[PDB]
Point group: none
Chain length 131, copies 2
């Protein structure tokens, strides 16, 4: 439940940090907290294209596999190789050290369609209250 003020969010609980012509993607604090302990991460290869709403990789917790969808379209230029040996950084640092991939955005106005922090907070409240 920590939500950061300067990121863009997808309903499936991924964040995007757009700085200039690159965008960094990871999963949110709400996502890691609900998956439980993350024990493995599967990432794409550099030079690969990802597409808005299609899966690019997977996070595995002690109980389950969760496929992660790209929040925007682009070409992977950098992959967090530190996560393979330290998958736990997703639980400890989802917004900083737990980043997963860096992309060159090919259709940057897809960022218009993403939820901002307040909208993502209300969304998580609604989703958790369907309980």
């Amino acid at each position: 439940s920590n939500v950061l003020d300067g990121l863009k969010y997808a309903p499936s609980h991924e964040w995007v940090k757009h700085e200039g012509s690159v965008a960094t993607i990871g999963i949110t604090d709400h996502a890691q907290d609900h998956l439980g302990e993350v024990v493995f991460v599967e990432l794409p290869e550099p030079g690969v294209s990802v597409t808005k709403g299609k899966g690019f990789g997977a996070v595995e917790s002690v109980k389950a596999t969760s496929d992660v969808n790209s929040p925007i379209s682009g070409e992977v230029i950098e992959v967090n190789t530190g996560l393979t040996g330290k998958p736990g950084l997703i639980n400890s640092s989802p917004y900083e050290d737990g980043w997963m991939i860096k992309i060159k955005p090919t259709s940057p106005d897809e960022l218009e369609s993403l939820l901002g922090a307040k909208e993502y907070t209300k969304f998580c409240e609604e989703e958790d209250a369907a309980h």
Copy 2:
């Protein structure tokens, strides 16, 4: 958990039995163990292609929902319809009657990136160890 000897395994805990030009896919004993009693299984249609690393279905247990990812690429030629009426066959028979789909392999050499039984047994040990 049992690990069978002639099978290949993906890190997301699916197995592959390749026989002739058919490959049968399911979830491992370790996977069903950690998931708990399976109560619902979502499976593709015959005719659909699956891609290595991409989800083709999902298992829903009493405790977690888990995406099921294809270990290799191919076209779905048969799905286990028995699984809709008896989802618990994944818990009782993960390697035989609980099979989920059969595919025709598109690139048989993807099998060479999968884990053999010994490596998989060890991988499961890291995962389950306190970190």
